[PDB]
């Protein structure tokens, strides 16, 4: 259906709902909770506004065996539209941990109800790391050059977060932290430069051990991954370019302004140097007279 | 200790041995005295020695003293009633406490009878407070204790459940320190209702029982009591859980049993009733009294737990463990924690702590806590006031008085209450002749009570504080 | 005879607040409503679990607009998911008016007292949610009977006494002669707190992302120029300004909007930044190649 | 290279300035004064 799924912006309310509902439907230990996600589409940017739980019973043994009460979904839906009839069914949340190729079948069910391709928004509830606990995937059927007679598949989609005005003010009222994703003062940003290096390193390391497995442990040759790595090597920086010379001109500019400004603060504080010393001279006389006053008092 | 007496048995004479006994019992902790009598009994000392050590003498003497030399300015009684109307619940509360302090140690039904109409306006937990204020007055005279509370003790009152409970609580106030026999009487009712406490009638009685038994069994560490209070705690009663939590750390005082700390610590996690959980936090504190470094594991853990609840008690566990040690660790923790903690209840609490730690050394205190009174954080200032009081209660250090004066007049209502209290706590019964300022602070109270442009909050503190000054 | 009757602190869950703001904001300025579902524990701890909204009626908040067919059926959808809990009160939004309970709202609340007599009425004011403030207040009826016999002190027993006294006149009169206003505290788990707190994937990556260089050029030039103009004021100031009478000195030599200080703040902000700027360029070059 | 030395030199003048200024006040404030 809708091909339009270029970006996914996600309401923090959705997250919050997915985390809470997980426990009040009382599912634990890899027992999946599937619920509906409501919001707008037929739009480039997809905006997931809100969500609601459905009952979901999943058989322990296999992921091909499961119970879902279809009829419930239609009954819930019509009351919900009365509240807000903008919202439409656009797909389903899956309560993590992590993608399955059994989902492909699951997705298809939801497609009956929906007039757009259902979005599979894996809201991971385990919150591993401080990085976003959303991967988004959409079921797409595409042809592939290998020989495969049409493959059916889940393609990763960029996940970001946006909140409404009403929503945003709720986020800030709740929080009481000092914060450090502020990237504000010299201190936060000092950290932030180091943090980014190591951020990169961890990712880079994962790429590196993954490449070993491809040509040694018979993980498939996924041509897409390799294909993408070429742009990284081609658009890698170079030295002895007249760009490098250009950076040096800029470097001189910024250090230059730094020194004029450094001297300029020295002047301001020194004016204060004088002001504290006037005060101090004055108070020598006051201290002297103070004694004479006390003599009378005694 | 016992060896001191075998030396003195070979020199035995009444005056000598008795002077040493009087010296010993004032200083000595209850646990020291208790183990010591058993040892003398097998040594077969004169019963004269043991009798002193019972402290039945010392209590007879102090009754006579206060009886004769108590001067009662009567104008206070008549005035509190008039100026602060007793229909309002808060106001009765303040008036009741001031009186119970004024009339300490010696019996007086002089207040009751004169102020029969005031008494009538008490209702709800205001009346519970009233019933218990009586047992501050009738503290001492241990003999006529049971007797004089006998109309109000259960099964002779049925009017109201608030009286029944609070007559039991106050019974314990009388009997701390003599309270071993008294422990039985209170235990009977706790075991009956050891389960059912989800009856609203039952609960109120039982609050008063549970505090009573804490007070009477203080520091004895009757494991019989700790268990009985525990079942109550589990039933998860609205208000008597609070009393239980406290009542257990009162009983077991200072034992620091590994079992005890643990069991309560687990229970805090489960509980949702905001009171119990706080109560257990403070309850952990009470049991780790003077436990120094054996409490460090607990101290790390509470501070480490995000809960508002557990950090509040975190502060007073450090405080009671290191009470009266300048230990550098204890001081650094309390300052760092108070300033940087976001939550208000927890913030006030770490400031209060400092007074306990610095009971021993009152010299460096106006200066450390100068810094905090400067902080124009609302909560922080309230707790500086309280802190000063604890630390310098006994002495008159001038620096302390001065630090407290800007706080008296601070626009935030809640500061003003603490502050006014904190001055009289410092200057407890110090002649106005010696120091003329005392008289001025006192009048200030009276003036605020006159003022109607004040909140009930200033009025509450101000009256109580005059009762602190004029005590017994 | 009965309980302490201290009005409950309404402990509002993180979800219930988020939905409430969202709900009101959509409906503004038309009044919005719904029921609060929760559970009642302790004496004064009401945990407001979650809320749902009832379809906007052309009668606004009314007993008429509490529609039992909708209500019931909703209980039942939530029942299957096992998220059902007792109704513990009701909220609605007045944006038109401050926070208080209108005569119509008092009747509505009276029906709820039969369910649970500790039920709350919560007024959400979503027009002023555009500030950093969340303007929300919670109320619980007082009986007329209580006020006539002057038995009202029972309800205000053993408490810290901090009461919101904002909003007076007719509103306050009504409040005093009908409901009791008490505090709202927000309790939230640290699990909830963390999910919310977490931001983008690109958040922890941004330090090697850098500003376009045409803007750094622009900024360097602007700061050098601006300080020059305030420096004129500062030179004029310390020509004199060593006499007496404080306030007069400030008017004579333009010591109001003080130049020394405004200069010291700008100079430093720009200085710190320029350290960050270089720091990123050097690092980028060297790390990658 | 050139500017770097100048920047470092300013900083030393700041610390000398800061240091000297505060010291007499301390003595004065403690002492009784009207």
From Swiss-Prot, chain A:
InterPro entries: EIF3F/CSN6-like_C, JAMM/MPN+_dom, MPN, MPN_RPN7_8
GO CC annotation terms, alphabetical: proteasome complex; proteasome regulatory particle, lid subcomplex; proteasome storage granule
Sites of N-acetylserine modification: 2
Key words of the record: Acetylation, Phosphoprotein, Proteasome
Residue span(s) of domain MPN: 8-143
Key word Phosphoprotein present: yes
One function term, GO molecular function aspect: metallopeptidase activity
Keyword Phosphoprotein in record: yes
An individual GO BP term: ubiquitin-dependent protein catabolic process
Post-translational modification: N-acetylated by NAT1.
Record family assignment: Belongs to the peptidase M67A family.
PANTHER family for the chain: 26S PROTEASOME NON-ATPASE REGULATORY SUBUNIT 7 (PTHR10540:SF7), EUKARYOTIC TRANSLATION INITIATION FACTOR 3 SUBUNIT F-RELATED (PTHR10540)
Miscellaneous comment as given in the Swiss-Prot or TrEMBL entry: Present with 19800 molecules/cell in log phase SD medium.
Role summary: Acts as a regulatory subunit of the 26S proteasome which is involved in the ATP-dependent degradation of ubiquitinated proteins.
Protein name: 26S proteasome regulatory subunit RPN8
Phylogenetic lineage: Eukaryota, Fungi, Dikarya, Ascomycota, Saccharomycotina
Swiss-Prot record, chain B:
PC repeat intervals: 129-162, 166-203, 208-242, 243-277, 279-312, 313-348, 349-381, 383-417, 418-455
Modified how: N-acetylated by NAT1.
Top-rank taxon, per record: Eukaryota
Family: Belongs to the proteasome subunit S1 family.
Function field: Acts as a regulatory subunit of the 26S proteasome which is involved in the ATP-dependent degradation of ubiquitinated proteins.
Additional free-text comment from the UniProt record: Present with 4750 molecules/cell in log phase SD medium.
Subunit and partners: Interacts with UBR1.
Protein name per UniProt: 26S proteasome regulatory subunit RPN2
Shown segment, full-protein numbering: 238 to 709 of 945
Swiss-Prot record, chain C:
Keyword Protease: yes
Reactions catalysed: Thiol-dependent hydrolysis of ester, thioester, amide, peptide and isopeptide bonds formed by the C-terminal Gly of ubiquitin (a 76-residue protein attached to proteins as an intracellular targeting signal)
Single GO BP term: mitochondrial fission
Sequence similarity: Belongs to the peptidase M67A family.
Species, as recorded: Saccharomyces cerevisiae (strain ATCC 204508 / S288c)
MPN domain span: 10-145
Subunit structure: Component of the lid subcomplex of the 19S proteasome regulatory particle complex (also named PA700 complex). The 26S proteasome consists of a 20S proteasome core and two 19S regulatory subunits. Interacts directly with RPN8 and STS1.
Database matches in Pfam families: JAB, RPN11_C
More info: Present with 16400 molecules/cell in log phase SD medium.
Domain of life of the native organism: Eukaryota
Record keywords: Acetylation, Hydrolase, Metal-binding, Metalloprotease, Protease, Proteasome, Thiol protease, Ubl conjugation pathway, Zinc
Entry function: Component of the lid subcomplex of the 26S proteasome, a multiprotein complex involved in the ATP-dependent degradation of ubiquitinated proteins. RPN11 is the only catalytically active member of the lid and serves as the essential deubiquitinase of the proteasome.
Post-translational modification: N-acetylated by NAT3.
Protein name: Ubiquitin carboxyl-terminal hydrolase RPN11
PANTHER family, A to Z: EUKARYOTIC TRANSLATION INITIATION FACTOR 3 -RELATED
The encoding gene: RPN11
Curated annotation (Swiss-Prot), chain D:
Annotated organism of origin: Saccharomyces cerevisiae (strain ATCC 204508 / S288c)
Bias (Basic and acidic residues): 22-34
Taxonomic path: Eukaryota, Fungi, Dikarya, Ascomycota, Saccharomycotina
Note: Present with 16700 molecules/cell in log phase SD medium.
Subunit relationships: The 26S proteasome is composed of a core protease, known as the 20S proteasome, capped at one or both ends by the 19S regulatory complex (RC). The RC is composed of at least 18 different subunits in two subcomplexes, the base and the lid, which form the portions proximal and distal to the 20S proteolytic core, respectively.
Reported modifications of this chain: N-acetylated by NAT1.
Domain of life: Eukaryota
Positions spanned in the full protein: 459 to 492 of 523
Residue ranges crossing the lipid bilayer per the database entry: none
Name recorded for this polypeptide: 26S proteasome regulatory subunit RPN3
Role this protein plays: Acts as a regulatory subunit of the 26S proteasome which is involved in the ATP-dependent degradation of ubiquitinated proteins.
Similarity-based family: Belongs to the proteasome subunit S3 family.
């Amino acid at each position: 259906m809708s091909l339009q799924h270029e970006k996914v912006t996600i309401a923090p309310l959705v997250l919050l709902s997915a985390l809470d509902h997980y426990e009040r439907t009382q599912t634990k230990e890899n027992k999946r909770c599937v619920g509906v996600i409501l919001g707008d589409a037929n739009s480039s940017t997809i905006r997931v506004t809100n969500s609601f739980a459905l009952p979901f019973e999943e058989d322990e043994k296999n992921s091909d065996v499961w119970f879902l009460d279809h009829n419930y979904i239609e009954n819930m839906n019509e009351m919900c539209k009365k509240i807000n009839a903008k919202e439409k069914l656009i797909g389903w949340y899956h309560s993590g941990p992590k993608l399955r190729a059994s989902d492909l079948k699951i997705n298809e069910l939801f497609k009956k109800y929906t007039q757009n391709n259902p979005l599979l928004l894996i809201v991971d509830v385990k919150q591993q790391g401080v990085g976003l606990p959303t991967d988004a995937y959409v079921a797409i059927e595409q042809v592939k050059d290998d020989g495969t007679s049409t493959e059916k598949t889940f393609l990763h989609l960029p996940c970001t977060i946006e909140a409404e005005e009403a929503e945003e003010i709720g986020v800030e009222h709740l929080l009481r932290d000092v914060r450090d994703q502020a990237a504000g003062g010299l201190s936060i940003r000092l950290t932030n430069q180091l943090k980014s290096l190591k951020g990169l390193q961890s990712k880079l390391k994962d790429v590196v051990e993954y490449l070993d497995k491809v040509i040694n442990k018979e993980l498939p040759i996924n041509h897409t991954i390799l294909g993408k790595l070429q742009d990284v090597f081609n658009l890698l920086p170079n030295l002895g370019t007249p760009d490098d010379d250009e950076i040096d001109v800029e470097n001189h500019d910024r250090i230059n302004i730094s020194n004029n400004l450094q001297k300029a603060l020295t002047v301001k504080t020194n004016d204060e140097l004088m002001v504290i010393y006037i005060s101090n001279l004055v108070r020598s006389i006051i201290a002297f007279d103070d004694l004479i006053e006390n003599k009378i008092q005694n | 200790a016992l060896q001191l007496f075998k030396k003195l048995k070979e020199e035995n004479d009444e005056g000598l041995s008795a002077q040493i006994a009087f010296d010993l019992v004032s200083s000595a902790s209850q646990q020291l005295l208790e183990i010591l009598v058993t040892e003398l009994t097998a040594q077969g000392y004169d019963p004269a020695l043991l009798n002193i050590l019972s402290g039945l003498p010392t209590c007879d003497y102090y009754n006579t003293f206060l009886l004769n030399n108590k001067n009662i300015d009567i104008g206070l009684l008549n005035k509190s009633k008039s100026s602060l109307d007793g229909k309002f619940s808060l106001f009765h509360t303040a008036v009741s406490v001031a009186n119970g302090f004024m009339h300490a140690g010696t019996t007086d039904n002089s207040f009751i009878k004169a102020n029969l109409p005031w008494l009538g306006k008490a209702q709800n937990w205001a009346k519970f407070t009233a019933t218990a204020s009586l047992g501050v007055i009738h503290k001492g005279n241990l003999l006529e204790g049971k007797k004089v509370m006998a109309p109000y003790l259960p099964g002779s009152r049925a009017s109201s459940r608030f009286i029944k409970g609070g007559s039991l609580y106050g019974l314990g106030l009388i009997y701390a320190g003599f309270g071993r026999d008294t422990t039985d009487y209170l235990k009977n009712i706790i075991v009956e209702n050891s389960g059912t406490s989800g009856d609203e009638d039952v609960d109120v009685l039982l609050h008063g029982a549970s505090l009573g038994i804490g007070l009477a069994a203080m520091g004895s560490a009757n494991i019989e009591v700790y268990e009985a209070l525990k079942e109550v705690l589990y039933n998860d009663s609205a208000t008597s859980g609070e009393a239980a939590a406290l009542g257990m750390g009162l009983c077991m005082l200072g034992t620091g049993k590994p079992e005890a700390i643990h069991d309560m610590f687990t229970y805090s996690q489960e509980t949702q009733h905001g009171n119990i959980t706080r109560g257990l936090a403070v309850g952990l504190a009470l049991i780790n009294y003077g436990r120094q470094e054996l409490a460090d594991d607990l101290i790390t853990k509470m501070l480490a737990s995000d809960e508002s609840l557990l950090r509040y008690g975190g502060a007073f566990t450090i405080a009671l463990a290191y009470a009266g040690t300048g230990n550098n660790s204890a001081v650094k923790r309390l300052l760092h924690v108070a300033v940087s903690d976001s939550n208000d209840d927890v913030r006030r609490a770490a400031v209060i702590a400092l007074g306990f730690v610095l009971l021993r050394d009152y010299t460096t205190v106006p200066r450390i806590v100068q810094l905090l009174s400067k902080s124009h954080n609302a909560h922080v200032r309230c707790g500086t006031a309280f802190a000063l009081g604890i630390a310098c209660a006994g002495k008159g250090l001038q620096s302390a008085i001065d630090v407290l004066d800007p706080l008296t007049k601070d626009p935030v209502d809640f500061v003003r209450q603490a502050a006014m209290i904190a001055l009289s706590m410092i200057l407890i019964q110090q002649t106005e002749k010696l120091n003329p300022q005392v008289a001025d602070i006192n009048k200030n109270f009276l003036s605020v009570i006159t003022n109607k442009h004040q909140e009930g909050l200033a009025k509450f503190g101000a009256c109580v504080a005059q009762g602190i000054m004029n005590a017994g | 005879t009965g309980r302490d009757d201290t009005k409950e602190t309404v402990y509002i869950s993180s979800i219930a607040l988020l939905k409430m703001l969202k709900h009101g904001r959509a409906g503004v300025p038309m009044e919005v409503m719904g029921l609060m579902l929760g559970e009642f524990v302790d004496d004064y701890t009401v945990n407001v679990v979650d809320v749902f909204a009832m379809p906007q009626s052309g009668t606004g908040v009314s007993v008429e607009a509490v529609d039992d067919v909708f209500q019931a059926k909703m209980m039942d959808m939530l029942k299957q998911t096992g998220r059902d809990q007792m109704v513990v009160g009701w909220y609605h939004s007045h944006p038109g008016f401050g926070c208080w309970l209108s005569s119509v709202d008092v009747n509505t609340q009276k029906s709820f007292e039969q369910l649970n007599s500790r039920a709350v009425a919560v007024v959400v004011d979503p027009i002023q949610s555009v500030k950093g403030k969340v303007v929300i207040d919670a109320f619980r009826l007082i009986d007329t009977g209580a006020l006539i016999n002057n038995l009202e002190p029972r309800q205000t027993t053993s408490n810290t006494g901090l009461l919101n006294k904002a909003n007076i006149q007719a509103l306050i009169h009504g409040l005093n002669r009908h409901y009791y206003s008490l505090n709202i505290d927000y309790h939230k788990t640290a699990k909830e707190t963390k999910m919310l707190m977490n931001l983008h994937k690109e958040q922890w990556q941004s330090g090697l992302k850098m500003y376009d260089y045409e803007e750094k050029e622009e900024s360097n030039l602007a700061a050098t120029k601006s300080m020059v103009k305030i420096a004129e004021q500062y030179s004029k100031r310390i020509e004199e300004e060593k006499e007496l009478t404080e306030e007069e000195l400030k008017t004579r030599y333009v010591g109001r909007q003080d130049p020394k200080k405004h200069l010291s703040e700008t100079a430093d902000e720009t200085l710190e930044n320029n350290i960050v700027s270089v720091l990123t360029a050097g690092v980028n070059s060297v790390a990658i190649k | 290279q050139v500017f770097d030395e100048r920047i470092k030199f300013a900083n030393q003048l700041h610390d000398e300035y800061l240091v000297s200024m505060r010291y007499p006040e301390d003595k004065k404030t403690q002492q009784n004064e009207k």
